[model samples]
Target: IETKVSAAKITENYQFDSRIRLNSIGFIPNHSKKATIAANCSTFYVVKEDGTIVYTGTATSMFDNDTKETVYIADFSSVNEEGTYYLAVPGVGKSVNFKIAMNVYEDAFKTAMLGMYLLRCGTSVSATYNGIHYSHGPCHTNDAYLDYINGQHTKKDSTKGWHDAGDYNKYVVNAGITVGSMFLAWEHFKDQLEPVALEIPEKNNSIPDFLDELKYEIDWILTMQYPDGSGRVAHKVSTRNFGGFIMPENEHDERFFVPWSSAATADFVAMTAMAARIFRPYDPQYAEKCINAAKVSYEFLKNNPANVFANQSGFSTGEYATVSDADDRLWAAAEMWETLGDEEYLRDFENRAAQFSKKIEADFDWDNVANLGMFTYLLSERPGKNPALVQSIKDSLLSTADSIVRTSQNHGYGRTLGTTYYWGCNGTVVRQTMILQVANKISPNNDYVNAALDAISHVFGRNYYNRSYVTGLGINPPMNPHDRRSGADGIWEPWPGYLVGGGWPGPKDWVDIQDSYQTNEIAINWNAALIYALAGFVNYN
Candidate 1:
């Protein structure tokens, strides 16, 4: 039950009376060259008592001179204070869904957090919210779609040559979610579908073929690993990786070599390892290679201490360091240790994981549960009597899930770092989903799993289109956008690769290369993760 405040109430009198325009929101690290942009050019709020704007507050536009179609809002905490808020546009209809900074649902929160990822295809064709039409296409493909295509990209303004960019949008297409998400999604959803494999019917000989491709990707990732460990590079040779992995003091390849990034390398290792395990049933080789790679990468992570921070490498940059990215890495380690059961590996992971958990725990931020999820899972595996630690972690996970719920609008999901209402690729949701499942496995009595289920139930609702498609915020249309075709905005983009980069905020430290406008409506990496995650739901439910 929600402890409703008068400020939280959205009276029935508040009805949609006009069209609404939806602008793409993005977050770029503080000093990035790619400026942010918004359709309305500013974030406007409307407060209504009975179908009228009782109050309004406006914030400077989140973007600058950059004509890019997205604006980066680093702090969702801006609206976290207890108050009813709705986005308003001049000709566009008023928002029916009042935005809340936070809402914590015990059972539903857990699942809703996970569902966030399943819903993020990261590009849209058109979205109709409150009967208002908001669409982006024939231009930008958004970062999510770009990730699907890898880093091969083209600029919206063809007049400009490809320059090394440091904006969050680039990594959204190249680093953060691209390879990491693909591997994660494949691992989680391998059995549910095979769109990636389906793309080339000839390549669809068997699941192993997909595994083979994954293996190659993972191998490529291994090559990107930094000798000292930690951090990831967006591309193989971008500025960061030129001398780090690819050109080390002595070795250099003339034609077949690519630059290496720690961020990319870390994501590759973590995601590929998970995917490899998931694909093990299909191909032993996938399992074998994944196991070996995980072992090596895990060792690298254990030995290197710097990666604990956000993106030290600048594939894409962000306003704040991400606990989520590091959480993913730790989670990967826990999974590797779990799958392999290497005592040495577990101990190494446990020690490093403990440090990571401690760093976040000291801050007492619920979003830190992202890290707790994996570390707690690792801790739970130990046969000890410290039920307090287990309980603490469980409580923390549930609490974080609750925080996610409190922030949702009419059960619709949105994630926050502290009080900030931030949106990004579905990775946030997927990570939360995995956290809950892991929590469920660790302590079945914990109520966190139920909380997760309830939150998702309310957020997803009964929309068929929403259920069928999965794109990130800017790249894909909202599942329930006002128009049907607008939902396909980022699906068909052909350049900057596609759907390879993952979610928004561009992983905080990666680049945003994918354009949100394209023709293709499907991406393999995101959908696959959803499938795998949903598969877990089926098994558990």
Candidate 2:
């Protein structure tokens, strides 16, 4: 008889140094039974390639509201041997083969980091294979300037940055969170990242490979700042309409620098302040430059408060418009406070903390990121002026982290999610994983770490779709991501390490078609969360 239960699964980080945990979900075929199997009734076994059962454990079950099924969590944290292994259940299904090794994530992390370089704009890429040179020439050179609602337009040197997404555009709002996450990854996991060489142009430099890759984007972000004393940065650089599927250099549309708003300015301030702290040890001069830029942007945010900006009528590019800048300002203030240790920023953060403290969401993205402000505040060592408010913020973060752990454990796949699925659902999964990882950092707990690992696993392959959302990863990964370069490059595979927007079973569930931008499209912001989550998990222990 065919079992109604899905096979037990583990993260793609299947190679474990110490121990591992496995999770599975059970269902009744066509609702044949009112309730599924109970907890501890089923047994699990780990088998070597030759089919020898090496370890066995009983499954514990719990009800999951999201999947409307019973989830079985099997513990194998005691097994510490090393070898290629597969998970098995008597009278049930078997998981894909995985290994137990020390360097499980090494290749994954290196390839994922390379994906960022592949997305670079305004620069050239080259490689040598057996003394043959293959190169991609410099592109997006005609990035020009455009006025606000109505003003004088001029041409300026604005080149160098990663393309924002499938479109050949660059956005400060998106880059802020994207680079901010990468910087945090470096700050937290520098020791581990120092040894992993990415073979970028600066690979041989004294600075770590992670920071070197980030410096490329940071330099481009700095170029987006308006020279005029407005303290505003260009929101984005792109043509009026998104061009067809063509390489960046071939796209002939006239690029324009859209005017800046409070949100973009605040985001810039936060990221620049963050860069100042992280880059100080590596390059003092560049760190000073970042601090100055952050100070000016913060002033603009302070004086020109609440001036929300969006793409004007002439542009058809991504607007990234926000209804409010309160969260942006709050995040900027917290980062500034941590980096500068100033009381003014702390007071500003306290003023905005109440607005974001009411309820915490299990997920976050580039748009709604007030929770990031709360997280940064709780994670930083700098004590705020208001001790009670600081304690309240910490309580809020830990409580939310605890809730996320519960949801992760309850979910059939052991993944964390919110009430709905959007275009970038996979990004949300990893971002939530990052939150769980940070929560563990603040308050050490195995549950949080295990939950985060599960989320990372879900990104690689362990979901209802049974597909890896990232390109060039596990079995049946995304082949036709909605990316302009991949679509036009004449390459059989889309760029590796780019995480596509994944889907669930609902109105917004993803289809694997090429035109499925809602589910198949890739973005730098999404990949940023991937790098952060993967690096966090790799370095957590």
Candidate 3:
């Protein structure tokens, strides 16, 4: 018996004789699964105008319950060619507008995501706890990094949305958290930040939680400034796990003293400057304090650059085992110079910059040193010659960049160099961001930029997202290696909790965990760099 059947339609077609870039060509459908028989198949075919198929034949399958047999079939054999096209059913009626525009919209969405991600890093914050508000920073680590945490958190506990007590508490004082939060807050709120015009005032413009957090940070910096125009890198007011203790004797012993990190000092000063700038328009008084704090810090840094090394005389910063300096010093100096408009500070910065340039050129054994050199060059107002040095820096950065691309892995993205726990995503984010931006400016190869983006995607997608909440500023993970063993000792210790996993563990397990409590001010260098990276994301792009 003859049966009535609806046939597929030739919906659209296109042709392009000229060659085009592969990436430029948008979405092409997979048409390998075209139905052979036509039985109420309302499918349509899309192809190039010149009879070329960019997409293969496509058709949908349906089940028929009346016959009790899966016999519904639709054929899309008529439309075989493709340059570019989309399916359209004529008699059945289907909306092709949104479908056709979907690609553009999707790109726009991705672009927005990238843009927003960067913006968040520059200016945003959140409260760690529900009632007692703390600041949440933006995704300094790529979205991939946060996603990793989210993924881990999801796998471990259903209740937690990527936030952990161990991590949040440690991040409470981290300047990167402040920077990230502020940067993100700015991104989400900047539209509301501006004046609506002379007649209408901008309303609901402030994220008080973020500002409050920043205020806390600023207050801390003010407290850390010593009377001698030099600030103690950390305040001794609070106990910390990483900052070592002060001995009863007057002598500053590496074993007994909290190792002073130049990076931490610079970080504090930088964030203080950032807070001042962000708050200046609204609160001029606080702005003045910020300015003073930065100036004092720079003055102090100039006098005590040598103090940053281990075995130095004054207050210890973080650890005494490594004497490496931080990239924060150069960036902080630059930031202070820009804010205060002090020529003297700029000259000091130039001197320091020169010193850093020399150091990077001289040393290949220092990982942190290489990053500082590359970052300084990227951040420098006018980066000069020394191709050999630049080549080495790029080579080193590219090596990490390659690692990021080869496997969808997140490693070496934090403070602990050898482990798989990343304290802050800023380390990876800032370093790569600078490389890409500079490569775009100088090298047209674009290889560096592409590699960087891949790494960024891996980081952001894996460890930075928490549904709508983005994590990965700088926090500890839950239940680190020593949490259980250390607690058994009966000595109160702030343990490393759950944070994003990428880099290394924080404050090694056996490294005098008990003595970290006596110091008031603790390490904030990582946080400062994170802030710089977050801010750079917005400002650079």
TM-scores, one per candidate = 0.44, 0.87, 0.44
Whole-model Cα lDDT of every candidate shown, in order: 0.35, 0.72, 0.34
The digit string of per-residue lDDT tens for model 1 on 1-541 reads: 5555334433433334222222122111121111111234344445432434434444333322212223322123233333344444343334334323223221122222222222222222233333343343231122111221134432111111011121101221133343443344344444533433212112546653334434433433444433333333333322223221111112221111123333344555555556565767777776787667666655565566454433334332222333444554555555665566667645644554555543223121212323533443444345532355446565665555545444432221222222221232332343445545544555653344433432232113211112212333222333322111223333332111112212234222222223331222223333333333443443221
| Candidate 3 lDDT over residue span 405-469, tens digit each | 33322221111121322334324443344444444444444444444433332222212210100
C-alpha RMSD for every candidate:
15.0, 7.3, 16.7
Instruction: Identify the runs in model 3 with alpha carbons over 4 angstroms from their true place.
Output: 1-216, 227-230, 235-237, 240-263, 308-322, 326-328, 357-431, 441-452, 460-499, 503-541
Candidate 3 overall Cα lDDT vs. reference? 0.34
Model 2, residue 437: displacement in angstroms?
A: 2.1
Better of 1 and 3 by lDDT: 1
Count the clashes in each prediction: 119, 0, 73
Q: How many backbone clashes does candidate 2 have?
A: 0
User: What is the C-alpha lDDT profile of model 2 across 236-274, one tens digit per residue?
Assistant: 887889899887778877788887767888888888898
Among these predictions, the greatest lDDT belongs to: 2
Model 2 regions more than 4 Å off: 1-44, 57-75, 89-93, 126-135, 147-153, 504-508
Cα lDDT, model 1, residue 136: 32
